[PDB]
Amino acid sequence: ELIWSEWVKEAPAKEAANREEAVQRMRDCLKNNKTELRLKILGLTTIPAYIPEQITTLILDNNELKSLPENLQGNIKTLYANSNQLTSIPATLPDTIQEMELSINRITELPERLPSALQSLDLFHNKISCLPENLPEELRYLSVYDNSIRTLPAHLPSEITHLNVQSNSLTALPETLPPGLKTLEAGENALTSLPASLPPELQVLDVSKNQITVLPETLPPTITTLDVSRNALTNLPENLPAALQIMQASRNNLVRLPESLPHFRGEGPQPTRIIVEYNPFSERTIQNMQRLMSSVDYQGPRVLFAMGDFSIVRVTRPLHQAVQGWLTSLEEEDVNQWRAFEAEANAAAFSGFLDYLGDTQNTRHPDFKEQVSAWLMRLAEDSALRETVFIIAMNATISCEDRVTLAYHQMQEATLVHDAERGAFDSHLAELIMAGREIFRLEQIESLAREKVKRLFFIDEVEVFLGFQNQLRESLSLTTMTRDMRFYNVSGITESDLDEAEIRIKMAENRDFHKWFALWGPWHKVLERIAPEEWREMMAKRDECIETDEYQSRVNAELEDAIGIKIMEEINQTLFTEIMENILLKKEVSSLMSAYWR
């Protein structure tokens, strides 16, 4: 029977015809009642086919085979093939084969002939164009390593629990794959994004070593481990899986951490660790999270920025080197000028300003970078303004290092100080008071941004200031003095806040802008420019009000209940509200203070 089979299947008689070494181990497997067939390193060319009945497992590794044998005719539950050349899979497969192995092939496509017996089938190191639309519903393990798959079908075997794919050039996933799947590996694929709905039993997700923008917000809570290392991720999801144990998000482009890590209850008995390394984090996040780690009452997850202990160092860059952070494309001629500006007083103060300003998420946006670059472009020429800009960068850092957003506002206001002094306002009061109301609005924005920070951990104050500004550009008539800039997010601003922001700023402009305008500020430079005599008269009157008859009348009632300066600041203040309202009416523009909005 089987004797006539291979003895006449040795008849092909290729070179190195040592198939007798196989039959010397073939019968011996049947003599000793073995179910394991060891066929290895034959120096093979072609293989006998019929053989044999009643052998559960046969191993075919280290072969120089060309393809599968014709009409195998044997009961087999396990077939291993490795390190040989194969066209593909012959359809001729019994329904008894529970697992297969194919790890080195010159294969190209899907036979999609189902034994239905299969539960385990790996396909490492062998290119395949695509995947079968419907595989047997007994498959449990499927590995596709080091290949090239363009698309995955819309329906895989509904009970696959383990799926491994590391094939090159796979770009995105079917939204739906079977729910029972609990482990998935998808690395080295050069992916783009993940589905909104993953299997509701998925516990292991690996998408390392591929380029992803942003992970989906909604994810199955069954996920306990997540490897998103070596990506291009910008913002980690707000709602992490409930059963999250270990997450590694290193080698990415993270600047700040998700806000919703206050108390993040970790189901896991072991604490929940979030590993984030080699990411351009802002000083605010590192300082806050690490300080939050020092607190014993902290019950949130473990964020490991570096391993293990460390300390933040505040090193001040040289001036000219901090400029190229905003000037990407520039010639050495610019550098030599900035290095020359480094010699002037209040130099280092502005150098640290550009760093803190550029150490956030949204201020690294290319269009905002363009605006600052343009602002820095004028400064190179100007000289005169830089001195005023540098002195307001020094006064802002001596109080508190955090106050960097207020300085930025007072630097853009400084431009309207020089122009007002350079005679850039030829009686165009109606045009400058509009820039006048906007600065007032932006001041109210800063006041709102200051109180918005107190309920947030990672978002910078500048992120909030620019958030309100850019979003309320149309609702607050910020036409001039403000360029629209698309940001990656709302910078943690609720829709209800905008409603509060609109109303509050609008009212504040209608109530006390008359008092505020008089005091502001660059207009004084204009005021000195337009009516010097009436300026001096109200200035001389201010000098003659120093010897006020009722000046002591205020002082004596204060000592009982240095000090006489507050009242001094109150008297001359009223003097500037009168000189305004007088000269402003002379130019028929007392109309304009008016009221505005509603």
């Binding site: 460390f310 160092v313 001040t316």
Partner: protein, 112 residues
């Protein structure tokens, strides 16, 4: 035969001498420590850093204090410390930060 006590770690004082030191290495590897005085975590891995200098006589050990050498600290992009940086042929190879004795020793043999 000449022998001197202490570690093989060389303390730097100038950026001009810092750049000079890494040029006079050749094919060897240069591991640089970025520590300071007031820092706690730096002290945890400080003695162990000197012990690796006596063990590994193949690579050069340098320590750059941030406080007095801020020109070098901003030159090599120090943001947190202790930070270990590794150089060969005047070029940066690997970068690592954090008070971890295990990673430090393992990173050295990783390169050499």
């Amino acid at each position: 035969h000449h022998h001197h006590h202490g570690s093989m770690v060389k303390q730097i004082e100038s950026k001009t001498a810092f750049q000079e030191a890494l040029d006079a290495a050749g094919d060897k590897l240069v591991v640089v420590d970025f520590s300071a005085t007031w820092c706690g975590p730096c002290k945890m891995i400080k003695p162990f850093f000197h012990s690796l200098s006596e063990k590994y006589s193949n690579v050069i050990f340098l320590e750059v204090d941030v406080d007095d050498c801020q020109d070098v600290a901003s030159e090599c992009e120090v943001k947190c410390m202790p930070t270990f940086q590794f150089f060969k042929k005047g070029q940066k190879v690997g970068e690592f930060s954090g008070a971890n004795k295990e990673k430090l020793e393992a990173t050295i043999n990783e390169l050499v």
